[PDB]
Design a protein around this ligand. Sequence first.
Ligand SMILES: [Cl-]
Ligand code: NA
Ligand code: NA
Lengths: 241, 241
Amino acid sequence: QMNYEEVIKKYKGNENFDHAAYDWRLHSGVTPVKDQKNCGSCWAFSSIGSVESQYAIRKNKLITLSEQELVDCSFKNYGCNGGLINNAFEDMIELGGICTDDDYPYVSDAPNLCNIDRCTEKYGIKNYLSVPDNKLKEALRFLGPISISVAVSDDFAFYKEGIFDGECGDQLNHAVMLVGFGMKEIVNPLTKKGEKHYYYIIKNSWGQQWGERGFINIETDESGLMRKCGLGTDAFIPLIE
Amino acid sequence: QMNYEEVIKKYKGNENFDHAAYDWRLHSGVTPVKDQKNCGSCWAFSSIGSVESQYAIRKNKLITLSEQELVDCSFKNYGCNGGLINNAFEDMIELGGICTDDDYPYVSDAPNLCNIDRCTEKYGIKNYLSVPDNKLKEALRFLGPISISVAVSDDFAFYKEGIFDGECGDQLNHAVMLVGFGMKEIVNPLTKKGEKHYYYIIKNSWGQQWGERGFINIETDESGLMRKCGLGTDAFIPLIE
Ligand SMILES: [Cl-]
Ligand code: NA
Ligand code: NA
């Protein structure tokens, strides 16, 4: 909702930001990685995650919120059976905040009723924007991490490190969040030349013991338009201001 | 990167230096002991300390650096859950500089995002060498304090002063730094003759209020080759020149 252009003006400084790299991790913009365990609640971890980052950035406070509370009360979704990023933010506004991760611990696939009263300090969001398929690097630089969707292939799970550029999935089947971009200049193992390999920085929800400390890097170009595997086809970022 | 021999040659130089004792503490080479508390920051405190000494020596400046920024930003380590000296030095260079421990105070196990911008005067290192497993005393005398590893056994810890000697090694499980050696001449409790007891000087991270102002003495021989408990299996010294 809202209007990209409408908010980007209120934040963006007209300065053709550095398009090669910016990493929210090393700017107090990325909360610790969590682990969805055996429940298909990706949609929830990513949306919750983008909110945590909005807080860590804007209102400068670190707080982990209950993903479990979304799986239990977001009726516009299907709990462990999947959901949609934007629906989450929707139900988030309806619920007027979510209980901290501490008063409403996560319990994965274990049946669990929805109890909104399990706490008294609910953390919420004023509204949420949608980012244009070709304004990712720009939004990431001034608005913050973005909740997005992507097609995850079977080999995608084995990824242990580097700049993934493997097989993609059928269609958009997973929700993760974008936290920044970077660019390592590797050598052409064949021509042996200074080549520039650009990449996006993803935060998964499979615990730290997966990929680079829980994060994965996706190839892309300087412009930040090469969205491999359908990258950010669906892209939203919550707003608390 | 820098491979030991290239720089060690630029410094060592044969020399019949006294192999019995040299103590960087009383040569303006050892900054005050710190306390990692109930957070597994062995590796960071050890590496940081060697940097503090390098500045205190080469650039004749007394400076204490932020261990908290390493636990939060190297990513080649696992914050309070442990890490490795060399990984730290790597990432230290990647980040190009570290906040002083005053602009980036330590908060042990207390959650804390990584903000490389938490300061404006960042102190760094050009590169880092690995010192030979049988060249410690030699290195200490000319290169400066060394970051090392050791196996702390269960009966240790009560040590309040003197030259602790009791626990044996295993696989390692803690990170500290070597700061010098000495040799006290006790009397022969059996034949009563002039016996020579050599020892190493380690710099811990459990505050001044522990042992002799925080330090402990480990047995060793004149050659500086008897590394009980693996003393220095892994040994590195950062370089700022
Ligand atoms: Cl974990
Ligand atoms: Na985790
Ligand atoms: Na880093």
